[PDB]
Write a protein that binds this ligand. Structure first.
Ligand SMILES: Nc1ncnc2c1ncn2[C@@H]1O[C@H](COP(=O)(O)O)[C@@H](O)[C@H]1O
Ligand SMILES: Nc1ncnc2c1ncn2[C@@H]1O[C@H](COP(=O)(O)O)[C@@H](O)[C@H]1O
Ligand SMILES: Nc1ncnc2c1ncn2[C@@H]1O[C@H](COP(=O)(O)O)[C@@H](O)[C@H]1O
Lengths: 301, 79, 411
């Protein structure tokens, strides 16, 4: 079952993954966190490499997760305080973040095989893996679970295909059904971040009284709070926060247990989302299949 | 119809039009990945593009090329 | 005796050329025919270019194209340098046009396509053939197209433009006739435009008995249009010959044009698999200009910023209003205010500065050129470098290096 997908990743460098022309912003550790997060929504990027002026090197990464942590961490009430965040600086917050645990920046050479990349993503449990040319020392592109899946289905050929993928999801046991981290439609966006910090999950499918999926709150959706400068009020519902795009999205991407693995990966790379919520006739939650599951279902199988 | 003609020596040289076209102010499609930019002109590549500092943080960027690829690196550094 | 280079014996002379005269070779054994360009060392020693010739031979060497005269080998000797090239009979296109009068559509289309692929080949290889004339393009036995003289050609560099202007008056772009900086693809497009014109009307679109009135005619985008052809070739020519180098057509623009598409073989441009190919080059690899158009699904990470929008004001570089010499002086003092040292090249407004990394032993350089934006204002440009494991970044070191310099020049 590893005869093809496993070899393919070892035969292609992360170089082929990199876009012809891309854009990446990098922050100085001397920069204030407030200005940093606003810069993220203005440039479109959800991740920026942290640069240290004194060390003259790349110390770490800055994602939306950071914005989630610092939001849940220092908070008093929606109306009472705009205080903590403003003054706080990137390196100063990394200090209280690393106070509990010390985890240096991870990176991969663009000349390394795609198999080394998918390994560093599962092993380190990280969605942002920067590719940095060791010769020049310049960060090129930030690899993503989405970027790889797209590249995989799009580039891989027809020929070796016929055998394993056809098998249905329910029977393949891929993805976590054991404990599903979710939020109600009336649950405050604060407790949403509280679950985002407790569990390392990247999304929280919202449910009504019936437990059906009427929307989904992704770790990326919270950056909108910084984009709209509404992050001061965390007492609002996730439905109230997702009400900004409510006139745009088609619905909640999902699939069924009895569907083929092949049909799932296709719909997944085309929708360009990070996961799907498996359900039934009642559209109630069953389990979650993310890109991390598919990527971890490849490297070994 | 011959022959070969002259050249202009008046200095300083006048700023070429190409450089005034920045890829960061251009707008991509709506469906593409936000981190994507069109293939830049080889002439504007090493050049620095500094964003007006309305913030106490100086923000300047340039589009550097790899072997076959291109990257626009924006850096936010406070004064 | 008789002069011969290798197994090729020289003979009857083909022409004068750019530098040296060219003659026909004949294989001692087989009897094959090649065109050798004879450049006398004594004649090229007088004029002094020690890099221009090196890069010329370098570029034409790798080139393999059906419409680009292919350089076989270069034989050298203390007497004169030789270049053996593919020989073709039927002379220059200038001889073809004049003798055949005015070519039609079904013909000109064929030839123009061919030539445009040759220059596309060149531009893709980062070289620009600056002097493009029907007098510089030959025809084989089958009356195809062959681009010939690369002498006036130059090699394109990253972040670099081309100052020099050369050649006859008629085919020179409105910018190079004015002696202004150019990238070099556009000067070919304009030169190709006037060629496409000659292939139709038989007469040059810009011609006058005495200059600058020829240049004055060239700077002005007004040119005679005969009833001879359809409006499509005119929309192409007028967009191709546009006076504004920014408003001009690129090699891509001509490919997409209607008149150029008709009866065009695939081999020329190296390109259900058509829709499948989209994805390979589609939004995945590059960004498409805004498509008034059907609503398309925006990338999930691009919607949240967008749905809340419907500012972004990014400048070029440091730009002041002071005098040319009075500016640089107020600058260099700050350039030397820090540890950084400056060795300025030829131009007084052009400086090349470099400094050693304060943390490591690495060193990153750059280029600062002072241009003139208008009557009342000047502009300073900042450009990175190149040279040929590490805990620091060449790209970032470039920014910090500039940022520190800019900090003193402003506040
Ligand atoms: N490659 C990395 N280097 C340094 N820190 C990282 C890296 N990837 C993730 N993190 C940390 O983990 C969070 C981002 O997780 P994620 O959204 O899953 O990529 C942030 O709080 C970062 O500090
Ligand atoms: N909403 C969720 N609740 C519980 N587990 C989840 C959830 N989303 C993802 N996971 C699990 O976490 C991994 C994916 O994490 P991520 O790449 O961050 O979305 C997979 O192993 C999933 O089984
Ligand atoms: N399974 C899904 N169904 C519907 N929308 C989704 C889904 N996954 C992600 N999104 C959307 O895509 C964004 C999150 O992308 P990502 O960070 O890749 O999970 C958010 O704006 C979500 O609304």
């Amino acid at each position: 079952n590893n005869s093809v997908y496993t070899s393919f990743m070892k035969s292609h460098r992360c170089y082929d993954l990199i876009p012809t022309s891309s854009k990446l912003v990098v922050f100085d550790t001397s920069l204030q966190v407030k200005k940093a997060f606003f810069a993220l929504v203005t440039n479109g990027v959800r991740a920026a490499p942290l640069w240290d002026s004194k060390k003259q090197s790349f110390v770490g990464m800055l994602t939306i997760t950071d914005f989630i942590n610092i939001l849940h961490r220092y908070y008093k009430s929606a109306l009472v305080q705009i205080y903590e965040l403003e003054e706080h600086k990137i390196e100063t917050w990394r200090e209280v973040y690393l106070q509990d645990s010390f985890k240096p920046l991870v990176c991969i050479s663009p000349n390394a095989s795609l198999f080394d990349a998918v390994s560093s993503l599962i092993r380190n449990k990280i969605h942002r893996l920067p590719v940095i040319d060791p010769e020049s020392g310049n960060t090129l592109y930030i690899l993503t679970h989405k970027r790889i899946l797209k590249f995989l289905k799009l580039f891989i050929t027809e020929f070796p295909k016929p055998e394993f993928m056809s098998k249905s999801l329910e029977e393949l046991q891929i993805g976590t059904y054991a404990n599903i981290a979710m939020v109600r439609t009336t649950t405050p966006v604060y407790v949403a971040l509280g679950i985002f910090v407790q569990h390392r999950v990247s999304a929280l499918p919202v449910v009504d009284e019936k437990g059906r999926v009427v929307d989904i709150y992704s770790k990326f959706d919270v950056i909108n709070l910084a984009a709209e400068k509404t992050y001061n009020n965390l007492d609002v519902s996730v439905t109230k926060a997702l009400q900004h795009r409510s006139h745009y999205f088609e619905g909640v991407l999902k699939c069924y247990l009895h569907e083929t693995l092949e049909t799932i990966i296709n719909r997944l790379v085309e929708a360009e989302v990070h996961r799907l919520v498996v359900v039934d006739e009642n559209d109630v939650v069953k389990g979650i299949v993310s890109l991390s599951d598919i990527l971890q279902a490849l490297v070994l199988t | 119809y011959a022959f070969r003609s002259e050249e202009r020596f008046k200095s300083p040289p006048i700023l070429p039009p190409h450089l005034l076209q920045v890829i960061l102010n251009k707008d991509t499609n709506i469906s593409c990945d936000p981190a994507l930019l069109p293939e830049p002109n080889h002439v504007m590549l090493n050049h620095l593009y500094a964003l007006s500092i309305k913030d106490s943080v100086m923000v300047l960027s340039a589009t550097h090329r790899y072997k076959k690829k291109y990257v626009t690196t924006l850096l936010y550094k406070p004064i | 005796g008789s002069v011969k280079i290798g197994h090729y014996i020289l003979g009857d002379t083909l022409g004068v050329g750019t530098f040296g005269k060219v003659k026909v070779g004949k294989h001692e054994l087989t009897g094959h025919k090649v065109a050798v360009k004879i450049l006398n060392r004594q004649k090229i020693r007088s004029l002094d270019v020690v890099g221009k010739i090196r890069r010329e031979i370098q570029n034409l060497k790798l080139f393999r194209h059906p419409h680009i005269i292919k350089l076989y080998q270069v034989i050298s000797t203390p007497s004169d340098i030789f270049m053996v090239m593919e020989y073709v009979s039927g002379g220059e296109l200038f001889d073809y046009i004049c003798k055949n009068g005015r070519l039609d559509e079904k013909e000109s289309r064929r030839l123009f396509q061919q030539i445009l692929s040759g220059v596309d080949y060149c531009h893709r290889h980062m070289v620009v053939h600056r002097d493009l004339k029907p007098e510089n393009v030959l025809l084989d036995a089958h009356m195809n197209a062959k681009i010939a003289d690369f002498g006036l050609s130059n090699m394109m560099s990253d972040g670099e433009f081309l100052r020099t202007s050369c050649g006859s008056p008629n085919y020179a772009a409105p910018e190079v006739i004015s002696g202004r900086l150019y990238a070099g693809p556009e000067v070919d497009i304009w030169s190709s435009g006037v060629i496409l014109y000659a292939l139709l009307c038989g007469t040059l679109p810009f011609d006058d008995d005495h200059v600058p009135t020829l240049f004055k005619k060239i700077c002005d985008g007004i040119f005679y249009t005969p009833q001879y052809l359809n409006p499509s070739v005119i929309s192409l020519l007028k967009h191709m010959l546009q006076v504004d180098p920014m408003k001009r057509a690129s090699i891509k623009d001509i490919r997409e044009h209607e008149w150029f598409k008709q009866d065009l073989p695939k081999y020329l441009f190296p390109e259900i698999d058509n829709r499948r190919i989209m994805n390979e080059a589609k939004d995945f690899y590059l960004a498409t200009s805004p498509p008034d158009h059907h609503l398309t699904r925006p990338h999930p990470e691009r919607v949240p910023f967008l749905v809340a929008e419907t500012r972004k004001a990014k400048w070029h570089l440091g730009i002041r209003s002071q005098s040319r010499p009075n500016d640089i002086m107020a600058e260099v003092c700050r350039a030397i205010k820090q540890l950084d040292y400056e060795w300025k090249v030829v131009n007084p407004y052009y400086l090349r500065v470099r400094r050693k990394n304060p943390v490591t032993s690495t060193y990153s350089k750059m280029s600062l050129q002072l241009y003139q934006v208008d009557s009342r204002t000047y502009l300073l440009d900042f450009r990175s470098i190149d040279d040929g494991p590490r805990p620091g970044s060449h790209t970032i070191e470039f920014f910090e290096m500039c940022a520190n310099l800019i900090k003193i020049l402003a506040q």
